[PDB]
Symmetry: D2
């Protein structure tokens, strides 16, 4: 199977696979069963912002999610990504719905990776920023139900013309260029990602959520990864 | 044929195809016959730096090349790149040798593109920076004789193990992700590129040169584009 | 007197000092009588964005102003800023009102300056970005009526508690650090500025406007520079 | 006294004030007696590079120092800088000599600070980069023996015309603009610094070292802070 590291914004509590009894943010290392979670006071229909940070010196993956006029949620996990991920990866966003549903709308997405070697003035870097998505966005790989250009947004899961989110949907966007997160001369490797999102549901129980993920470069949506598996995992192990 | 916009660092004067009688920097719009040139006091065996800038408001492509402890050469040309290039492009470096030869070594390469729309806080951006090239650089497309990872450099043309440059060589490196240089809501589009290079020849007459270029995304080395055609053009029209 | 280079967003036509008969954007070199102007379809009560760009190779100062869902206005002027400004400057925003009035509210302001020398990998750079202004913003020099921290904005001119703009007001904000825009080894010097603004008036005839400016480091508001003089000039010469 | 947070590159072991028996990198929180140290294989006469990173989510100050062709040294310390430093600070470099001496030459220095609030698209940022220092560098505050512009470098301590380092010297450079490292709406605050340095001594025992530091904005060199106190502390408590 693929190798996945993800930060989940998990809108539906699946307590049978170890979710807490509430919407939560989590850090997923090769499993949907988050290694660490925090309570998330998700706001139906409001624009939120998520920040993800990591560096190879501290080996700590951290994330913060907030809405305007509200307190943040934060989660951290100690993990050496050089022991989990290959040296070249792709980065992306994933989302799903199941019998319960929501919009999984991405309004902006930025990413920076840096690899600093012991050579004098020797940083390698990649940065991208999308504030508007176009109908034919050639620097994104869209998978499953993901589409771009409707109001300049990335719709990770299926939405009707009238704007109703559909059930049993899964979709992903990956940046086209591979990202280098380890090199033998590297003294520090870091990355940061930010995305803004709008999760709206006509229902009291939205599902299933959005994730930022890092994967092997050839990652594809696993078979049957609608609903609680967030487009990331083939099963709940 | 491909569509090419390039800044050439032209080490060998081909006066029969309109080069001036000296090494020169030039701006090439869909032809090896530069629309504008400036005299370039090329230094055999020294590390040089080239800077290329453009924006869609001024519609002027400019370049500056320098060496430490020396005066710069500069060239500019008024051109609307939205009338020359497609809306999605790839960017890259090209170099060639012919019967006369030189190393075409790239020590670093950085690039930034920005597309700002009339949406409040709506920039799209791409930035990359290579200060060290690795043996298997997955975010570069290498064409022809180009190789990476020898002393952390990009060798655009063939060099022996003993470091001797070879004749009749052509090679290109392109960044893997397409670049968006026009969008219908854009109020300003810009890019900048920088590269550092080492051109060394055992001969009094080095050839043929290095170019930074922008192309259709599917660009490949034209047949017979060794020597004076710099890996960019199928003929001298 | 001070030395001033400015891009004006001029909301009130003073045809006696050479304004065109309409709101306009202009480039001001040591005079309120703009060297170049363009018609500006100013929108009372809407958030606008202005972009200013310059580099020392092309020696062209350009600006673009837009609102969402509207066409942009643009103006350019050929000028060698190394012949107008000292090598060290301060950058800032200025605004004024007179007998006619408006809010001169700044919601965000960013600035980047770069000085690249002929030394290998030798850029000097300054970048700042304000998306929220605080009540005691120590990296800004406020002059005249300018205040910060009301709704996280910079109010360049006086506004009552009920939000009514006041007449006969002038105010400026300058970034605290001086900016280096020339050095003897520089091969290219550039800057870019962006700001977002909200000009609102209860009146059919708002005045007087907002400017981005570059000045000698010790610049202060000239005596009597309310109204048409935009906080920048001591007279209309 | 001032409030100081510093990363020390400590070239001389003062075992009486808790240094280990070897050159070391350390994290100093309001004391020269480092809270954490790591062995540093300092290279007399070689150019080194130091990297310092921090963020408010992980509350961990980390540093890495390396030379080309050598293994790095790294040190980390868990500390909430919002409990140590004021909300506005200055950042700088410090160095000293005593009866033992060395050059404390800075070849480049860069710094980035970011404060992200819970407002949609609301980052405040400061970035500067010096690759060449000029004789009259108006965006630096020089203290004590520090000078700029000799070969484009910052000499933190006294060096003769023939290049001999002098004993009993102390000097500091601070960036002119205050830096905002806390705000009540901040969800994440971070900074990174990099500097390149050349420590050369005619002696087998160089002293005393270089530090990157963060201070109250009005910080000055403490009386008697030559030698082991690195220009940072009034005593060895
Ligand atoms: Ca769940
Ligand atoms: Ca030629
Ligand atoms: Ca006017
Ligand atoms: Ca010591
Ligand atoms: Mn979960
Ligand atoms: Mn030519
Ligand atoms: Mn005017
Ligand atoms: Mn120590």
């Amino acid at each position: 199977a693929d190798t996945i590291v993800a930060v989940e914004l998990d809108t539906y509590p699946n307590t049978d696979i170890g979710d807490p009894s509430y919407p939560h943010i989590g850090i997923d290392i090769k499993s949907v069963r988050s290694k660490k979670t925090a309570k998330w006071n998700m706001q139906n229909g409001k624009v939120g912002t998520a920040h993800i940070i990591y560096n190879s010196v501290d080996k700590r993956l951290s994330a913060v999610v907030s809405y305007p006029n509200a307190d943040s949620a934060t989660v951290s996990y100690d993990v050496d990504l050089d022991n989990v991920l290959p040296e070249w990866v792709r980065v992306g966003l994933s989302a799903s719905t199941g019998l319960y549903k929501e919009t999984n709308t991405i309004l902006s997405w930025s990413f920076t990776s840096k690899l600093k070697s012991n050579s004098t003035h020797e940083t390698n870097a990649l940065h991208f920023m999308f504030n508007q998505f176009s109908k034919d966005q050639k620097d994104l790989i869209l998978q499953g139900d993901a589409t771009t250009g409707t109001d300049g947004n990335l719709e990770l899961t299926r939405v009707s013309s009238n704007g109703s989110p559909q059930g049993s949907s899964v979709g992903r966007a990956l940046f086209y260029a591979p990202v280098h997160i380890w090199e033998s001369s590297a003294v520090v490797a870091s990355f940061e990602a930010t995305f803004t999102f709008l999760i709206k549901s006509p229902d009291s129980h939205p599902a299933d959520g959005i994730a930022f993920f890092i994967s092997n470069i050839d990652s594809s949506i696993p078979s049957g990864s609608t609903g609680r598996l967030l487009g990331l995992f083939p099963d709940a192990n």
